[PDB]
Write a protein that binds this ligand. Structure first.
Ligand SMILES: Cc1cc2nc3c(=O)[nH]c(=O)nc-3n(C[C@H](O)[C@H](O)[C@H](O)COP(=O)(O)O)c2cc1C
Length: 151
């Protein structure tokens, strides 16, 4: 059918997912790319401190983080690709806030993740939870399923 008008959104703590999002942007004709940020002080330069902050959000003890991103009408797109690192089998916590803000999006969603190779099944299942109510068509590592998602 008609080419899917595609938005690529990503959160990146150490820059790897940003590079992947840029690569996917280059692969998908006319795609738009937008970064999701959090304020300085939300996490930490130290990965173990960052993990512990995310965990306390996951466990319900601290609120999920507020995010900063451009104003977007999500219903301008057919497909929204959401990029994140894998954080102990979950997407990064800013993604939960993002997905909540996308509540009224009627199109297709997929997530690409970057990782060091582990806890992928958990990422998939948790992403789908966090995206409940949205039409999730797939979750995959890197750009491995970009072609599939485009059809
Ligand atoms: C808090 C934290 C938890 C992580 N947990 C996992 C994990 O469960 N499995 C894995 O393969 N990599 C894990 N990683 C590594 C990241 O998924 C990987 O470095 C990713 O490519 C980083 O993306 P980014 O640079 O966009 O933040 C973790 C990294 C951090 C900081």
């Amino acid at each position: 059918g008609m080419a899917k008008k595609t938005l690529i959104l990503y959160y990146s703590w150490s820059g790897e997912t940003k590079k992947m999002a840029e690569k996917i942007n280059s692969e998908i004709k006319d795609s738009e790319l937008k970064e999701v940020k959090v304020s300085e002080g939300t996490f930490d330069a130290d990965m173990y401190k960052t993990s512990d902050i995310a965990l306390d959000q996951i466990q319900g003890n601290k609120d999920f983080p507020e995010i900063q991103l451009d104003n977007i009408d999500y219903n301008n797109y057919d497909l929204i690709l959401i990029g994140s690192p894998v954080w102990s089998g979950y997407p990064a916590t800013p993604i939960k806030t993002l997905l909540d803000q996308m509540k009224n999006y009627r199109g297709e969603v997929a997530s690409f993740f970057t990782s060091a190779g582990t806890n992928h099944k958990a990422y998939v299942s948790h992403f789908n939870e966090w995206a409940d109510g949205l039409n999730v068509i797939g979750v995959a590592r890197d750009d491995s399923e970009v072609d599939k998602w485009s059809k």
